[PDB]
Amino acid sequence: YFQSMIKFVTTEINGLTLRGTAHVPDGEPGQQFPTVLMFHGFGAVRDEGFRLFIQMSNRLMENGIAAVRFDFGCHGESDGEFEDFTFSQELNEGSALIDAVKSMSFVDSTKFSLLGEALGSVAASIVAGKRSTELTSLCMWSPAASFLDEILNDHTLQGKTVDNVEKDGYFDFYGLKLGKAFFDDLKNINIFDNAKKYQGPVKIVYGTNDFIPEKYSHKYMDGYENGELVIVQDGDHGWQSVPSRKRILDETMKFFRKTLLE
Amino acid sequence: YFQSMIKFVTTEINGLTLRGTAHVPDGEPGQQFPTVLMFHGFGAVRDEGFRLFIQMSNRLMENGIAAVRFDFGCHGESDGEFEDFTFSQELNEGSALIDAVKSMSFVDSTKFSLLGEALGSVAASIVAGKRSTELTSLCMWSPAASFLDEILNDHTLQGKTVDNVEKDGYFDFYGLKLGKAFFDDLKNINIFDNAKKYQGPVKIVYGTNDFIPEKYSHKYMDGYENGELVIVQDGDHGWQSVPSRKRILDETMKFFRKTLLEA
Ligand SMILES: [Ca+2]
Ligand SMILES: [Ca+2]
Ligand SMILES: [Ca+2]
Ligand SMILES: [Ca+2]
Ligand SMILES: [Ca+2]
């Protein structure tokens, strides 16, 4: 019998090494656990903001659910330059990470779910529709499903103009160079028609102080046969208040207990 | 022969597992390399913001300098609750990390330096002064040396009031609880009298848009026998523009080439 452990994991997808962390519950040798794979947001890292995914991972681990989270390609400690990042490759990696994680010794291939934050929720929704028979459930926090509308119609990315990409040669995201390839690839992305292909249990948690409009969470619900939408009064995009951090962890543990343990 | 590699490392300090990443250059079996140990800022993680420490780590690694960076206790993936965090224990961990990292198999303990960002620069400056023979050189980005003055004199932590910590039991830092122990421990901290004990090469990089007042960088320089201050026009606290990111990486590689590869 081995106590719980935190270990570091890697995988190779399309020639990039993706680097991640796994939180494995207490158990006997060779035990396979229900597992949540977590997708971080745009230009974020696998910890997410202010220990958010770390706290969620430990909460799951203490309750018998393994938690795995990788840096996407061109993010965090994974290989790849942000200038080469495209959302299509994030989607390819998210699908490939299902098989990478289900191959791990401690993961029950039949009790496996996705959790997302922000753009990671958008990726999770699309991967879930394309790999619907792989997922026991799907949980989406603060989904950034407005990102196509904002960039393509309002010509901004998180409020900053995208109209100087040709003049500058890049878009400046907090000191990272985001390339033209990202913007050229946006025409290939479909969120909601792909997302409605997943008809397992879905939970969406939206905070009223999120800068993403609430209507995008309702649009997801319009397409889900088994959706639940929780509106957290005065929650924000990253669950960056003490009360809303407790709320997001509790609501999510409740959902994964119901769908992966009960 | 071995190509460069990224490996994950852990060490135990005062009952907490601290978790870190090491970037090891290309080399022969058992080769040892000049090494930079990096200290992140307050409530940050070992990647620092927007890949900052990752980019610096890879730049060093590509040039034959190993880079090591841990989450401090109560930060990132390391053990410890933020409610229990104190700066004194950060200083103790920084001291213990010098010893743990100097014993790593790929580290040349005779060519070993610290790099800091923000509060990590303050920690680096104090540890460097207390362990004045241990470091080949010291580089500080955007040192947050105002933090005691801000909390103790202006009664704010990054602009938010600290006056309710005793009544309410904690301070809310972006969803994390920061306990009274942190605030009670501030009286134990001395920055500048400790920092001036280090007499090796020091480089400070300050951006004109940093919210930390420039005067604090001059106070450090006033106590350093062998200091250099670079002032980056339009640089900010976290080096969060493409031009200022290029500048900070280039200036720091230049300093570590001089102090770790050419000396
Ligand atoms: Ca246990
Ligand atoms: Ca593979
Ligand atoms: Ca690789
Ligand atoms: Ca090489
Ligand atoms: Ca431990």
Residue numbers in the entry:
A (entry chain B): -3 to 258
B (entry chain A): -3 to 259
What does the paper say about this structure?
Here, we report the crystal structure and biochemical characterization of a feruloyl esterase (LbFAE) from Lentilactobacillus buchneri, a LAB strain that has been used as a silage additive. The LbFAE monomer structure includes 260 amino acids that forms the canonical α/β-hydrolase superfamily fold with a conserved Ser-His-Asp catalytic triad. The protein forms a homodimer with two-fold symmetry where the active sites from the two monomers are oriented facing each other. The two subunits associate to restrict access to the active site such that only single FA chains attached to arabinoxylan can be accommodated, an arrangement that excludes access to FA cross-links between arabinoxylan chains.
A variant with the catalytic serine replaced by an alanine (S114A) was generated to enable binding of different alkyl hydroxycinnamate compounds. Several S114A crystals were soaked with substrates, including MF and MS, but no binding was observed in the crystal structures.
